[PDB]
RNA sequence: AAAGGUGAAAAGAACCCCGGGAGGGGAGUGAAAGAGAACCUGAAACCGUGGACUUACAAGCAGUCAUGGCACCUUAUGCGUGUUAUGGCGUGCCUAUUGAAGCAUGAGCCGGCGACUUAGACCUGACGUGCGAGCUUAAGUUGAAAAACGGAGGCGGAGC
RNA sequence: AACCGAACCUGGAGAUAGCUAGUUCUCCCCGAAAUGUAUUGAGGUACAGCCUCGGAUGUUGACCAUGUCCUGUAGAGCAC
RNA sequence: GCGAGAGCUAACUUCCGUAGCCGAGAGGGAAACAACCCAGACCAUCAGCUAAGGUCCCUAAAUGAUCGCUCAGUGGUUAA
RNA sequence: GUAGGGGAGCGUUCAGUCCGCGGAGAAGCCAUACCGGAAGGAGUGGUGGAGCCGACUGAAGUGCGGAUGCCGGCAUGAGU
């Protein structure tokens, strides 16, 4: 078969986001919003007042059987 | 003197091949009928509805696509710059009629 | 790699079920209590709601 | 597409200001200068006429030819506004008063400065431009 | 693979620069003022096209009452009296009729005045 | 730190001319000297010479649209191209901002360099392919102008 | 050793930077927010609220009318 | 603009409520002029109708018609 | 229509395969009134003197006007 005429399944490859690179979309400020702590990055899944700290009822081990319904 | 009332086709008097907005049916010999809005023949003027009964035959000449322009648009300080092309179709018609 | 935040595990947030995030009921821990007998009892097992996506990746492997 | 003309012609006329309200004589002359009476043909060109104002000395004025009409000119020097020749006084040289009115109604661009050429004000009854036989306008419109 | 900018940037810049014909000064020669002038020029081209429609409107009208008053009626009591003469509707650039054939514009004056009686 | 390039071959320019030279003009060589040693191409900013059309009562973000003038005719005698006069209209660009022509930031100009990436048997979704109640390998072994083998282990399948 | 409230050089080292600046090809579709709570919080963040995309459902949405209940402002009053 | 507090019944003040506009809204009017008046720009046309606002000349369009008013440039700058 | 989400695409280098082109002249450069809805693409001429286009697929150090951005060249102030 023609390697010229090989064609990947449509919709199986989509192009990367090219962030920057024009006022034809995604201008100036990148995907990002303007000021703020959005810039060279860090900090995770943490709200930085009091993160919903609920109490802890605990027992360490376990061992469970393999099933055959 | 004669000129399209560029709303579509209707006109006054005198015979000479000229441009217009497109006329659907093509080739030549559309013989497209025209309804007078004014006439000056022998410099004997007749006008408004009374003249409008008068015929103006005119054959189609060529379909066309007039000179290109660019629709470019701009707004300030907002990154709004956009460029597009545009080109209007037309229809030469040679005047011939009464 | 990817840790679980072990602050999630023996703490409330059972992961369990049709993918939804149970948690506990909180106030009047073992901090002091006169207060009602129908609240001292109604502190068993809650379950949160619009924060679950955060809770899940705390502990997506269900420790 | 639209017709534009030559420049070929110049047409002259005498307006008699004698007893006319100034200001109305003003807009009459200013339009005959601009070219609004023949079809304006084209704005680019001064198709307007040459006008000769006679008896400019006798122009009528209402309310106050005194008191009211304080004409004013600034000199460039500190204290140079206090130059308010006003009033009846400028009818010691009438040809300027009329000439000021018309000039405020011609446009300020390069054509208007050129249109100033076409106004010819003579305070006395008589004018010397006999050579370009002007013939007359007159009173009022419709 | 490196992929430097070469040939791309000059081509773009040269197309901008070539849009600059008799632009004054560094409007014609430096890319940055050429491109910037073109932004404001965009503004002007579009606005003006729409406006040129309205400007020839104005030239039209300004000839038509000059001829009208030459025949002793103003624009207002004229384009009224053709429309009140109803089927008379030629409207588009009556200017030219007034500006070249006066034998005709006089007949149109008589028509308008007859319709207003 | 910057770093580069005659020509296939030095055949690297005998001789003559102006010049103290430098530099050049010829003659020669060579396919080319439209390659001559400040030696491949040779953009742009910047400096000049010549020509067309223009400009010494003019108020101007430098354009834009309209019309006249004068040139010109190789995608080109037209809805042309260049340039003009005159009218109408017209508050640089970016950033930052409630709000920018702003007397608020940045920038002399042009050229080139210059900023959303990579990684991991990691998580979570969309789309696509293979096999489907089952799907798949890792390290490695052997073969490599090519890839096969390798179930240790991983995910579904039971929840509280 | 020509800038000493703690010298110069090289290294950790691309320190960290809730702060400034900058972030470049194109057309098409939709289109916001500057509100509320919490915050060693106030020019930063988390969750809501408003945008978009895809799937499901399928008029449940919008004004306007009729019916019905709720209210103590405008006005007024002097019975507290 | 409306409804209130704070303020001097000041402020292009400040802080809530409420509608609309700007924010991100070009076009016509208001001389100029984010917010006000009219109106939400897919592209082309040397075609026609209107809105706000206008029709002496700059400047598109009645030196319009009929009753009156003001002789102050009131128009075109407050009051006791 | 700003942040923002979505869609379809243009151009640059490299790689695989095809179709080819080139000293009767390639890339690059230079002019231009042609074409496409845009990014852009062709025609012809001038220059150059040895490589290169078009199509399909793949991978990116892939698109600059800004950063008191870097390197280099050249201007203004000034014949001061
Ligand atoms: Ca000197
Ligand atoms: Ca000096
Ligand atoms: Mg990626
Ligand atoms: Mg996008
Ligand atoms: Mg920024
Ligand atoms: Mg940083
Ligand atoms: Mg962490
Ligand atoms: Mg605290
Ligand atoms: Mg502007
Ligand atoms: Mg803005
Ligand atoms: Mg469990
Ligand atoms: Mg304009
Ligand atoms: Mg009309
Ligand atoms: Mg060599
Ligand atoms: Mg020499
Ligand atoms: Mg020598
Ligand atoms: Mg030879
Ligand atoms: Mg030479
Ligand atoms: Mg050479
Ligand atoms: Mg030399
Ligand atoms: Mg070579
Ligand atoms: Mg060279
Ligand atoms: Mg010279
Ligand atoms: Mg010269
Ligand atoms: Mg002078
Ligand atoms: Mg002059
Ligand atoms: Mg000057
Ligand atoms: Mg001009
Ligand atoms: Mg401020
Ligand atoms: Mg402003
Ligand atoms: Mg300035
Ligand atoms: Mg500035
Ligand atoms: Mg500042
Ligand atoms: Mg500075
Ligand atoms: Mg894995
Ligand atoms: Mg590992
Ligand atoms: Mg010292
Ligand atoms: Mg020293
Ligand atoms: Mg120190
Ligand atoms: Mg650093
Ligand atoms: Mg470190
Ligand atoms: Mg620190
Ligand atoms: Mg919309
Ligand atoms: Mg609270
Ligand atoms: Mg805050
Ligand atoms: Mg949120
Ligand atoms: Mg949806
Ligand atoms: Mg409902
Ligand atoms: Mg309903
Ligand atoms: Mg009350
Ligand atoms: Mg108070
Ligand atoms: Mg305020
Ligand atoms: Mg903003
Ligand atoms: Mg809005
Ligand atoms: Mg507006
Ligand atoms: Mg406006
Ligand atoms: Mg205006
Ligand atoms: Mg005002
Ligand atoms: Mg204001
Ligand atoms: Mg605006
Ligand atoms: Mg009308
Ligand atoms: Mg009205
Ligand atoms: Mg008028
Ligand atoms: Mg009147
Ligand atoms: Mg060749
Ligand atoms: Mg080209
Ligand atoms: Mg060779
Ligand atoms: Mg890069
Ligand atoms: Mg930028
Ligand atoms: Mg720069
Ligand atoms: Mg420099």
From Swiss-Prot, chain B:
GO-annotated molecular function: rRNA binding; structural constituent of ribosome
Record flagged with keyword RNA-binding: yes
Keywords recorded for this protein, A-Z: Ribonucleoprotein, Ribosomal protein, RNA-binding, rRNA-binding
TM segment ranges: none
Top-level taxon: Bacteria
Pfam families: Ribosomal_L21p
Record InterPro entries: bL21-like, bL21-like_sf, Ribosomal_bL21
Any one Gene Ontology cellular component term annotated for this protein: ribonucleoprotein complex
Family, similarity comment: Belongs to the bacterial ribosomal protein bL21 family.
Subunit composition and interactions: Part of the 50S ribosomal subunit. Contacts proteins L15 and L20.
The protein's name in its UniProt record: Large ribosomal subunit protein bL21
Organism of this sequence: Deinococcus radiodurans (strain ATCC 13939 / DSM 20539 / JCM 16871 / CCUG 27074 / LMG 4051 / NBRC 15346 / NCIMB 9279 / VKM B-1422 / R1)
Gene name per UniProt: rplU
Curated annotation (Swiss-Prot), chain C:
Pfam families: Ribosomal_L35p
Assembly mode: Part of the 50S ribosomal subunit. Contacts proteins L15 and L33.
Protein name: Large ribosomal subunit protein bL35
Superkingdom of the organism of origin: Bacteria
Keywords of the record: Ribonucleoprotein, Ribosomal protein, RNA-binding, rRNA-binding
Lineage: Bacteria, Thermotogati, Deinococcota, Deinococci, Deinococcales
Function: Binds the 23S rRNA.
SS bond list: none
GO BP terms in the entry: translation
GO MF annotation, one: structural constituent of ribosome
UniProt cross-references to InterPro entries, sorted A to Z: Ribosomal_bL35, Ribosomal_bL35-like, Ribosomal_bL35_CS, Ribosomal_bL35_sf
Family (UniProt): Belongs to the bacterial ribosomal protein bL35 family.
UniProt KW Transmembrane helix keyword: no
HAMAP family to which the protein is assigned, alphabetical: Ribosomal_bL35
GO CC, any one term: cytosolic large ribosomal subunit
Swiss-Prot record, chain D:
Any one GO biological process: negative regulation of translation
First and last residue of the signal peptide: none
Region named Disordered: 124-142
Top-level lineage group: Bacteria
UniProt keyword annotation of GTP-binding present: no
An annotated GO cellular component: cytosolic large ribosomal subunit
Alphabetically ordered keywords of this record: Ribonucleoprotein, Ribosomal protein, RNA-binding, rRNA-binding
GO molecular function, one term: mRNA binding
Record has Ribosomal protein as a keyword: yes
Protein role: This protein is one of the early assembly proteins of the 50S ribosomal subunit. Binds to the 23S rRNA.
Similarity section: Belongs to the universal ribosomal protein uL13 family.
Subunit structure: Part of the 50S ribosomal subunit. Contacts proteins L3 and L20.
Identification of the protein by name: Large ribosomal subunit protein uL13
Organism: Deinococcus radiodurans (strain ATCC 13939 / DSM 20539 / JCM 16871 / CCUG 27074 / LMG 4051 / NBRC 15346 / NCIMB 9279 / VKM B-1422 / R1)
Gene responsible for this protein: rplM
UniProtKB/Swiss-Prot annotation, chain E:
GO-annotated molecular function: rRNA binding; structural constituent of ribosome
Keywords recorded for this protein, A-Z: Ribonucleoprotein, Ribosomal protein, RNA-binding, rRNA-binding
Protein's name in the database: Large ribosomal subunit protein bL20
Pfam family, any one: Ribosomal_L20
Domain of life per record: Bacteria
HAMAP family noted in UniProt: Ribosomal_bL20
Gene: rplT
Gene Ontology BP, a term: translation
Keyword Aminoacyl-tRNA synthetase: no
GO cellular component, one term: cytosolic large ribosomal subunit
CDD domains: Ribosomal_L20
InterPro entries the record matches: Ribosomal_bL20 (IPR005813), RIBOSOMAL_L20_CS (IPR049946), Ribosomal_protein_bL20_C (IPR035566)
Ribosomal protein recorded as keyword: yes
Function: Binds directly to 23S rRNA, probably serving to organize its structure.
Family of this protein: Belongs to the bacterial ribosomal protein bL20 family.
PANTHER family referenced in this protein's UniProt entry, alphabetically: 39S RIBOSOMAL PROTEIN L20 (PTHR10986)
Disulfide bonds: none
Subunit organization: Part of the 50S ribosomal subunit. Contacts proteins L13 and L21.
């Amino acid at each position: 078969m023609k390697l010229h005429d090989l064609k990947p399944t449509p919709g199986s490859r989509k192009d990367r986001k090219r962030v920057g690179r024009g006022p034809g979309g995604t201008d100036k400020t990148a995907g990002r919003g303007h000021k703020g702590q959005k810039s060279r990055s860090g900090a995770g899944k943490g709200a930085f007042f009091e993160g919903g700290r609920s109490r802890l009822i605990a027992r360490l081990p376990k061992r469970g059987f393999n099933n055959v319904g | 003197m004669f000129a399209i009332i560029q709303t579509g086709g209707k006109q006054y008097r005198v015979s000479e091949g000229d441009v217009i907005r497109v006329e659907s049916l093509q080739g030549e010999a559309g013989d497209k009928v025209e309804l007078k809005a004014l006439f000056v023949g022998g410099e004997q003027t007749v006008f408004g509805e009374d003249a409008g009964k008068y015929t103006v035959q005119a054959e189609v000449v060529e379909h066309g696509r007039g000179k290109k322009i660019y629709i470019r648009k701009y707004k300030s300080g907002v990154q709004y710059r956009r460029r597009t092309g545009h080109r209007q179709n037309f229809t030469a018609i040679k005047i011939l009629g009464i | 790699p990817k840790m679980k935040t072990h602050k999630m595990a023996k703490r409330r947030i059972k992961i369990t079920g049709t993918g939804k995030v149970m948690a506990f009921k909180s106030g009047k821990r073992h901090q002091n209590t006169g207060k009602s007998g129908d609240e001292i009892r109604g502190k068993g097992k809650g379950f949160v709601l619009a924060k679950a996506e955060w809770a899940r990746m705390k502990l997506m492997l269900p420790r | 597409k639209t017709y534009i003309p030559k420049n070929d012609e110049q047409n002259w006329v005498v307006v008699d200001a004698s007893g006319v309200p100034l200001g109305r004589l003003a807009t009459l002359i200013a339009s005959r200068i601009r070219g609004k009476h023949r079809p304006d043909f084209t704005p680019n060109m001064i198709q307007g006429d040459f006008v000769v104002v006679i008896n400019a000395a006798q122009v009528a004025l209402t309310g106050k030819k005194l008191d009211d009409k304080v004409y004013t000119r600034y000199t460039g020097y500190q204290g140079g506004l206090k130059t308010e020749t006003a009033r009846e006084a400028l009818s010691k040289h009438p040809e300027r008063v009329i000439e000021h009115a018309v000039f405020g109604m011609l446009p300020k661009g390069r054509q208007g400065r050129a249109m100033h050429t076409r106004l010819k004000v003579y305070a006395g009854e008589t004018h010397p431009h006999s050579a370009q036989k002007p013939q007359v306008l007159k009173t009022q419109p419709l | 693979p490196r992929a430097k900018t070469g040939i791309v940037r000059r081509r773009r810049h040269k197309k901008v620069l070539k849009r600059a014909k008799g632009f004054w000064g560094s409007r014609s020669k430096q890319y940055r003022n050429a491109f910037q002038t073109l932004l404001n020029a965009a503004t002007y081209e579009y606005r003006d096209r729409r406006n040129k429609k309205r400007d020839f409107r104005r030239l039209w009208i300004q000839r038509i009452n000059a001829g009208a008053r030459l025949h002793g009626m103003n624009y207002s009591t004229f384009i009224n009296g053709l429309k009140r003469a109803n089927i008379d509707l030629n409207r588009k650039v009556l200017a030219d009729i007034a500006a070249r054939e006066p034998e005709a514009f006089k007949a149109l004056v008589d028509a308008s005045r007859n319709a207003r009686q």
